[PDB]
Write a protein that binds this ligand. Structure first.
Ligand code: CL
Ligand code: CL
Length: 162
């Protein structure tokens, strides 16, 4: 299992514009298009991302492509972040994937806000961080996914995705 497969599981794959759990326009593999309420604004961000006049639909290949960019960007956002980098650097490979996932779903900024959890993960206090992570809107709004990520940090294995 790896980051890609992991996220493909959490996010799914849709080739037509759709609304995410927060009601925002999205497409592909969890690729947020816009927070605006306008579908055109969305269509417009789509065309611009892909480089062609799409009419709200895309191919698998295009989806995979945005997905690769998005992953790359998340990692890079983590590395450029003064609060995240050190966490990430201290983690093992599995757990890093968990941190990427969160970053991918919530943005660097969102994640950089879990100060306390972060600190706990840095200290390798697994059970405690898992508790702390759960006391969040994130967990309350998308509890199944949060559970998967949290177990991953708690155990350092992929069992939640098997
Ligand atoms: Cl883009
Ligand atoms: Cl969920």
């Amino acid at each position: 299992m790896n980051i890609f497969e992991m996220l493909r599981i959490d996010e799914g794959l849709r080739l037509k514009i759709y609304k995410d759990t927060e009601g925002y326009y999205t497409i592909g593999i969890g690729h947020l298009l816009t927070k605006s309420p306008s579908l055109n604004a969305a269509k417009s961000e789509l065309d611009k991302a892909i480089g062609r006049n799409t009419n709200g639909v895309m191919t698998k290949d295009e989806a995979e492509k945005l997905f690769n960019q998005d992953v790359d960007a998340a990692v890079r956002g983590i590395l450029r972040n003064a609060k995240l980098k050190p966490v990430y650097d201290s983690l093992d490979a599995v757990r890093r994937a968990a941190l990427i996932n969160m970053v991918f779903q919530m943005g660097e900024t969102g994640v950089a806000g879990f100060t306390n959890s972060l600190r706990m993960l840095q200290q390798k206090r697994w059970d405690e961080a898992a508790v702390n992570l759960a006391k969040s809107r994130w967990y309350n709004q998308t509890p199944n996914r949060a559970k998967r990520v949290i177990t991953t940090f708690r155990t350092g294995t992929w069992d939640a995705y098997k």
